[PDB]
Amino acid sequence: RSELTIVPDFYPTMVRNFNPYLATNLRTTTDFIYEPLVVFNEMKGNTPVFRLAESYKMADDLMSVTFDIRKGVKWSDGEAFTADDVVYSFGLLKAKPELDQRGINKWVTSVEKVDEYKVRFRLSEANSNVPYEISLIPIVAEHVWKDVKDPTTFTNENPVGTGPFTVIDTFTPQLYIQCRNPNYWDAANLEVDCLRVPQIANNDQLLGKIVNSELDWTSSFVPDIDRTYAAANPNHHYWYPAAGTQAFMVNFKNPDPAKKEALDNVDFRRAFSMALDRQTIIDIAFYGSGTVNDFASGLGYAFEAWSDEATHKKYKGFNTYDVEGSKKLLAKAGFKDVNGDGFVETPSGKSFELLIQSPNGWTDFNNTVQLAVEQLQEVGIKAKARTPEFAVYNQAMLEGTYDVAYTNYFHGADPFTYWNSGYNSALQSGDGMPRFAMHYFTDKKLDGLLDSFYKTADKNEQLAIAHGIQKIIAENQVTIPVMSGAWMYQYNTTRFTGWWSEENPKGRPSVWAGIPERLLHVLDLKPVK
Ligand SMILES: CC(=O)N[C@@H]1[C@@H](O)[C@H](O[C@@H]2O[C@H](CO)[C@@H](O)[C@H](O)[C@H]2NC(C)=O)[C@@H](CO)O[C@H]1O
Ligand SMILES: [Mn+2]
């Protein structure tokens, strides 16, 4: 039996939860258990790869879109996958908005069933990118979920899915094995029998295992990769294609008076920013992987084609290592040390210590925070590194109780994914939504520009919109962008072949939940002969 050992996420222990709509689920639920209608290859310019749906047609006015369901597709329990499943799934999100992870309810007014295998989504507002948005909404089995009294707490321990791996062959607190859907519609293309998911708590436990060659597919941070991982075995390979932005997010509505006086001050945010030595952070914390990001808008040099150089040039200084500039700005802004501790107090003389959070176990982020704390001390800003578990880290953000948080973002073929997910105020409310836009800075015009991006197909018009977004975010120094990272990815050729690589760059190689292309990737693998 071919078992692919994968690590899409860390856990202190394995807790059986296969609900695709819950943040507490196992990260092998979406894609592998519940296959999407279409998987967009974001690397290749967002090209749709059709799976459960054979085709779709967006109406010319961009106010609706139809999807043709592939016939002959079955759930793991033998029942047919039809339009009823799709209709029910979005109806569920309407019934329980906390299960709405994309904020899709705002855009989709209704989801009508045209026929057994055809559904039509009607929008509340024009969005040519709705197909992509729809593709990220998990679709569950209506014949099963309609009998579930409360979907919000349903742990779905014995999942019925459309994906390649639905059989829970083994489940212990330290390991679970997800095997082949006995009724998989694409069985002929699946050459991996089981997904082996061992329990790993953090980067330290992961390093020990990966160098010992007991893992096949991973996307974790690995220090000194060449010496410690690559040079240790000819079967140890990796490929780090460029990815999105990473930055420090500040909470504009921190409940502490002193902290809010600091964080909700553009001059302080710029001074915080200038204190950071971005290159040293990349060299030290990331071992030279990644590039400096001195775009106040967080755009990133990779997307320079979308940048208005003038805007970049004007705020670039506030996003460049400059100790003197930082200290001079703080003083001019009225931030001074009035109690002799070497740290600046707020203009009204209040003391404060910024708690910078980064998830426990994410050592590359943890090290970045500590480096940042030390760099901030140099400019007189008091800070302390905190490493709460991801759940806590994430929660403190959805509830706005955190101070500052270092985080990465998802990355698409253009800056929209980043700008929209990291700034659309519509994504700042609602349980079930990620952390990305939870800084609580809001602007009507910004939201308007963002929401207008896919209302037109005119690239020159989209560029004009991009420029407008850039300036508003840059002008307000909403976050403190630091760098553009990469899709960390490590593969072992000891047991399987067919992996994506620089030589075979089929798309984002990550195995993390949220990278739907992982379904396509796993379907390219085959055990060694
Ligand atoms: C865009 C995003 O939020 N991606 C998340 C990933 O960062 C995260 O993976 C973890 O990222 C850390 C920071 O680079 C790494 O140190 C850590 O090793 C890595 N963990 C694994 C298992 O690869 C994943 C998993 O928590 O979630 C994504 O949402
Ligand atoms: Mn002081």
Coordinates of all heavy atoms in Angstrom, one line a residue, residues 7-10 27 202-203 206 218-222 246 286 359 361-365 390 407-411 435-436 487-488 490 511-514, ligand 1:
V7 N 2.6 16.7 5.9 CA 2.5 17.6 7.1 C 1.9 18.9 6.7 O 2.6 19.9 6.6 CB 3.8 17.8 7.8 CG1 3.6 18.5 9.1 CG2 4.5 16.4 8.0
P8 N 0.6 19.0 6.4 CA 0.0 20.3 6.1 C -0.1 21.2 7.2 O -0.3 22.4 7.1 CB -1.4 19.9 5.5 CG -1.7 18.6 6.2 CD -0.4 17.9 6.2
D9 N 0.0 20.7 8.5 CA -0.1 21.5 9.7 C 0.4 20.8 10.9 O 0.4 19.6 11.0 CB -1.5 22.1 9.8 CG -1.6 23.2 10.8 OD1 -0.5 23.9 11.1 OD2 -2.7 23.5 11.3
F10 N 0.8 21.6 11.9 CA 1.2 21.0 13.2 C 0.0 20.9 14.2 O -1.0 21.7 14.0 CB 2.3 21.9 13.8 CG 3.5 22.0 13.0 CD1 4.2 23.2 12.9 CD2 4.0 20.9 12.3 CE1 5.4 23.3 12.2 CE2 5.2 21.0 11.5 CZ 5.9 22.2 11.5
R27 N -6.3 19.7 8.7 CA -6.0 20.3 7.4 C -5.8 19.4 6.2 O -5.2 19.7 5.2 CB -4.7 21.1 7.6 CG -5.0 22.5 8.3 CD -5.6 22.2 9.8 NE -5.6 23.4 10.6 CZ -6.6 24.3 10.7 NH1 -7.7 24.0 10.1 NH2 -6.5 25.4 11.5
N202 N 5.8 21.2 16.2 CA 6.4 22.5 15.8 C 7.6 22.3 14.9 O 7.9 21.1 14.4 CB 6.9 23.2 17.1 CG 7.8 22.4 17.9 OD1 8.9 21.9 17.4 ND2 7.5 22.1 19.2
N203 N 8.3 23.3 14.5 CA 9.4 23.3 13.6 C 10.5 22.5 14.1 O 11.3 21.9 13.3 CB 9.9 24.7 13.2 CG 9.0 25.3 12.2 OD1 9.2 26.5 11.8 ND2 8.0 24.6 11.7
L206 N 9.7 18.9 13.7 CA 9.7 18.6 12.2 C 11.1 18.4 11.7 O 11.3 17.5 10.9 CB 9.0 19.7 11.5 CG 9.0 19.3 10.0 CD1 7.7 18.9 9.4 CD2 9.6 20.4 9.2
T218 N 6.2 18.1 2.5 CA 6.1 19.2 3.6 C 6.3 20.6 3.0 O 6.8 20.8 1.9 CB 7.2 18.9 4.7 OG1 8.5 18.8 4.0 CG2 6.9 17.5 5.4
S219 N 5.9 21.6 3.8 CA 6.0 23.0 3.4 C 6.3 23.8 4.6 O 5.8 24.9 4.8 CB 4.7 23.4 2.8 OG 4.3 22.6 1.7
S220 N 7.2 23.3 5.5 CA 7.6 24.0 6.7 C 8.9 24.8 6.5 O 9.6 24.7 5.5 CB 7.8 23.0 7.8 OG 9.1 22.7 7.9
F221 N 9.2 25.6 7.5 CA 10.4 26.4 7.5 C 11.5 25.4 7.9 O 11.3 24.6 8.9 CB 10.4 27.5 8.5 CG 11.7 28.1 8.9 CD1 12.4 28.9 8.0 CD2 12.3 27.7 10.1 CE1 13.7 29.4 8.3 CE2 13.6 28.2 10.4 CZ 14.3 29.0 9.5
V222 N 12.6 25.4 7.2 CA 13.7 24.5 7.6 C 15.0 25.3 7.6 O 15.4 25.9 6.6 CB 13.9 23.3 6.5 CG1 15.1 22.5 6.9 CG2 12.6 22.5 6.5
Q246 N 5.0 39.5 3.8 CA 5.0 39.2 5.2 C 5.2 40.5 5.9 O 5.9 41.4 5.4 CB 6.2 38.2 5.5 CG 6.1 36.9 4.9 CD 7.1 35.9 5.4 OE1 7.2 34.7 4.9 NE2 7.8 36.3 6.4
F286 N 15.4 33.9 8.1 CA 15.1 33.1 7.0 C 16.2 32.5 6.2 O 16.0 31.9 5.2 CB 14.2 33.9 6.0 CG 12.9 34.3 6.7 CD1 12.9 35.5 7.4 CD2 11.7 33.6 6.6 CE1 11.7 35.9 8.1 CE2 10.5 34.0 7.2 CZ 10.5 35.2 8.0
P359 N 2.8 32.9 16.0 CA 2.4 31.6 16.5 C 3.6 30.7 17.0 O 4.6 30.6 16.4 CB 1.7 31.0 15.3 CG 2.1 31.8 14.1 CD 2.2 33.1 14.7
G361 N 5.9 27.7 17.6 CA 6.3 26.6 16.7 C 6.8 27.1 15.4 O 7.6 26.5 14.7
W362 N 6.3 28.3 15.0 CA 6.7 28.9 13.7 C 8.0 29.7 14.0 O 8.0 30.9 13.9 CB 5.6 29.9 13.2 CG 4.3 29.3 13.0 CD1 3.8 28.2 13.5 CD2 3.2 29.8 12.1 NE1 2.5 28.0 13.1 CE2 2.1 29.0 12.3 CE3 3.1 30.9 11.3 CZ2 0.9 29.2 11.6 CZ3 1.9 31.2 10.6 CH2 0.8 30.3 10.8
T363 N 9.1 29.0 14.2 CA 10.4 29.5 14.6 C 10.9 30.6 13.7 O 11.6 31.5 14.2 CB 11.4 28.4 14.7 OG1 11.5 27.8 13.4 CG2 11.1 27.4 15.7
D364 N 10.7 30.5 12.4 CA 11.1 31.6 11.5 C 10.5 32.9 11.8 O 11.1 34.0 11.8 CB 10.9 31.2 10.0 CG 9.5 30.8 9.7 OD1 8.7 30.4 10.6 OD2 9.1 31.0 8.5
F365 N 9.2 32.8 12.2 CA 8.4 34.0 12.6 C 8.8 34.5 14.0 O 9.0 35.7 14.2 CB 6.9 33.8 12.5 CG 6.3 33.8 11.1 CD1 7.1 33.8 10.0 CD2 4.9 33.9 11.0 CE1 6.6 33.8 8.7 CE2 4.4 34.0 9.7 CZ 5.2 34.0 8.6
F390 N -1.3 29.0 17.6 CA -1.9 29.6 16.4 C -3.4 30.0 16.7 O -3.8 31.1 16.4 CB -2.0 28.7 15.2 CG -2.7 29.2 14.0 CD1 -2.1 30.3 13.3 CD2 -4.0 28.8 13.7 CE1 -2.8 30.9 12.3 CE2 -4.7 29.4 12.6 CZ -4.1 30.5 11.9
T407 N 2.9 38.3 10.3 CA 2.1 37.3 9.6 C 2.5 37.3 8.1 O 3.1 38.3 7.6 CB 0.6 37.5 9.7 OG1 -0.1 36.4 9.1 CG2 0.2 38.8 9.1
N408 N 2.1 36.3 7.4 CA 2.3 36.2 6.0 C 0.9 36.3 5.5 O -0.1 36.4 6.2 CB 2.9 34.9 5.6 CG 2.3 33.7 6.2 OD1 1.4 33.8 7.0 ND2 2.7 32.5 5.8
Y409 N 0.7 36.3 4.1 CA -0.6 36.4 3.5 C -0.6 35.4 2.4 O 0.4 34.8 2.0 CB -0.8 37.8 2.9 CG -0.8 38.9 3.9 CD1 0.4 39.5 4.3 CD2 -2.0 39.4 4.4 CE1 0.3 40.6 5.2 CE2 -2.1 40.5 5.3 CZ -0.9 41.1 5.7 OH -0.9 42.1 6.6
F410 N -1.8 35.2 1.8 CA -1.9 34.3 0.7 C -1.4 35.1 -0.5 O -1.4 36.3 -0.5 CB -3.3 33.7 0.5 CG -3.5 32.5 1.3 CD1 -4.1 32.5 2.6 CD2 -3.1 31.2 0.8 CE1 -4.2 31.4 3.4 CE2 -3.2 30.1 1.6 CZ -3.7 30.2 2.9
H411 N -1.1 34.4 -1.6 CA -0.5 35.1 -2.8 C -1.1 34.6 -4.1 O -1.1 33.4 -4.3 CB 1.0 34.9 -2.8 CG 1.7 35.5 -3.9 ND1 2.0 36.9 -4.0 CD2 2.4 35.0 -4.9 CE1 2.7 37.2 -5.0 NE2 3.0 36.0 -5.6
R435 N -7.4 35.8 9.7 CA -6.8 37.0 10.4 C -6.3 38.1 9.5 O -6.3 39.3 10.0 CB -5.6 36.5 11.2 CG -4.5 35.9 10.3 CD -3.3 35.4 11.0 NE -2.2 34.9 10.2 CZ -2.2 33.8 9.4 NH1 -3.3 33.0 9.4 NH2 -1.1 33.5 8.7
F436 N -6.0 37.8 8.3 CA -5.4 38.8 7.3 C -5.9 40.3 7.3 O -5.1 41.2 7.2 CB -5.5 38.2 6.0 CG -4.9 36.8 5.9 CD1 -5.7 35.7 5.6 CD2 -3.6 36.6 6.3 CE1 -5.1 34.4 5.6 CE2 -3.0 35.3 6.3 CZ -3.8 34.2 6.0
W487 N 7.0 29.9 -1.2 CA 6.2 28.8 -0.8 C 7.1 27.6 -0.4 O 7.5 26.8 -1.2 CB 5.4 28.3 -2.0 CG 4.4 29.3 -2.6 CD1 4.5 29.9 -3.8 CD2 3.2 29.7 -1.9 NE1 3.4 30.7 -3.9 CE2 2.6 30.6 -2.8 CE3 2.6 29.4 -0.7 CZ2 1.4 31.3 -2.5 CZ3 1.4 30.1 -0.4 CH2 0.8 31.0 -1.3
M488 N 7.6 27.7 0.9 CA 8.5 26.6 1.4 C 7.9 25.3 1.0 O 6.6 25.1 1.1 CB 8.6 26.7 2.9 CG 9.1 28.0 3.4 SD 7.7 29.0 4.0 CE 7.1 28.0 5.4
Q490 N 9.3 20.9 0.6 CA 10.3 19.9 0.6 C 9.7 18.6 0.2 O 8.6 18.2 0.6 CB 10.9 19.7 1.9 CG 11.5 21.0 2.5 CD 10.5 21.9 3.3 OE1 10.8 23.1 3.5 NE2 9.4 21.3 3.7
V511 N 1.7 22.1 0.4 CA 0.7 21.1 0.8 C -0.2 21.6 1.9 O -1.1 20.9 2.4 CB 1.5 19.8 1.4 CG1 2.2 20.1 2.7 CG2 0.5 18.6 1.5
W512 N -0.1 22.9 2.1 CA -0.9 23.6 3.1 C -2.4 23.6 2.7 O -2.6 23.7 1.5 CB -0.5 25.0 3.4 CG 0.9 25.3 3.9 CD1 1.6 24.5 4.7 CD2 1.7 26.5 3.7 NE1 2.8 25.1 5.0 CE2 2.9 26.3 4.4 CE3 1.5 27.7 3.0 CZ2 3.9 27.3 4.5 CZ3 2.5 28.7 3.0 CH2 3.7 28.5 3.8
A513 N -3.3 23.5 3.6 CA -4.7 23.6 3.3 C -4.8 25.1 2.8 O -4.0 25.9 3.3 CB -5.5 23.5 4.6
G514 N -5.6 25.4 1.8 CA -5.7 26.7 1.3 C -5.0 26.8 0.0 O -5.0 27.9 -0.7
Ligands
LIG1 C1 -0.5 32.3 4.2 C2 -0.6 31.5 5.5 O1 -1.2 31.9 6.5 N1 0.1 30.3 5.4 C3 0.1 29.4 6.6 C4 1.5 28.8 6.7 O2 2.4 29.8 7.1 C5 1.5 27.7 7.8 O3 2.8 27.0 7.8 C6 3.7 27.3 8.7 O4 4.3 28.6 8.4 C7 5.4 28.9 9.3 C8 5.9 30.3 8.9 O5 6.6 30.3 7.7 C9 6.5 27.8 9.3 O6 7.6 28.2 10.3 C10 5.9 26.5 9.7 O7 6.8 25.5 9.7 C11 4.8 26.1 8.7 N2 4.1 24.9 9.1 C12 4.1 23.8 8.2 C13 3.4 22.6 8.7 O8 4.5 23.9 7.1 C14 0.4 26.7 7.5 C15 0.3 25.6 8.6 O9 0.1 26.1 9.9 O10 -0.9 27.4 7.5 C16 -1.0 28.4 6.4 O11 -2.3 29.0 6.5

